[PDB]
Amino acid sequence: ILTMLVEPDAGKATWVAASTYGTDTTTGEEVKGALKEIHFSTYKLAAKSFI
Amino acid sequence: VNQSSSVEVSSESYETIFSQRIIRDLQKELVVGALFEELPMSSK
Amino acid sequence: TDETEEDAIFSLLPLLRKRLIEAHAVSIEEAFMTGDGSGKPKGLLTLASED
């Protein structure tokens, strides 16, 4: 198997209002991302001949 | 796994070659972020 | 907040620190007068009532 990593999708940031200043959301919500994994594998093709 | 032969790898993690390559799609071209100029403001 | 500082033509932290030092001076004062004394300094006008 080969398991390369795929980067997660983009995150929007928050537009904070005037009244959340010096508050704790004045820095928005958190952009959480989660790397994901893709797998590569093989199958077999085969043949026989007899002379 | 690959248990075909006498002698087999223990977990299939000793099989896979984990890679550390990261890939991102065509990803929405961001057209309108920079088309317009800036007024560097210094007040509300 | 970072923003008020940017949203003012004037600086605004000189005031904070002054109004800061001042707040402490006033406070010792209000209390040294009539400070009940529970977690505040007891004061000359309540020290008197006590005596």
CA distance A34 to C46: 63
Q: Are C24 and C30 in contact (CB under 8 A)?
A: no
Q: Is A16 exposed, middle or buried (0-12, 13-18, 19+ CB in 10 A)?
A: middle
Q: Are C42 and C36 in contact (CB under 8 A)?
A: yes
CA distance C6 to B40: 12
Distance of CA C31 to the CA centre of its chain: 10
The per-residue DSSP string of C7-39 comes to T-SS--HHHHHHHHHHHHHHHHHHHHHS---SS
CA distance A4 to B21: 5
- Residues 6 or more apart whose Cβ sits within 8 Å of residue B16: A1, A2, A3, A39
Q: DSSP 3-state assignment of C44?
A: helix
B42 at interface of C, judged by CB pairs closer than 8 A: yes
CA distance C35 to C28: 9
CA distance C4 to C11: 9
Q: Are C38 and C50 in contact (CB under 8 A)?
A: no
Please write down the HEC assignment for all residues of chain A: CEEEEECCCCCCCCCCCCCCCCCCCCCCCCCCCCCEECCECCCCCCCCCCC
8-47 of C, contacting B, C-beta below 8 A = 8-9
Resolution, Å (one decimal): 3.4
- Residues 6 or more apart whose Cβ sits within 8 Å of residue C36: C42, C46
In the numeric block, the tokens 């509300």 are attached to B44
Q: Is there a contact between B17 and A5 if contact means CB atoms under 8 Å apart?
A: no
Residue C13 distance to chain B (closest CA, Å)? 16
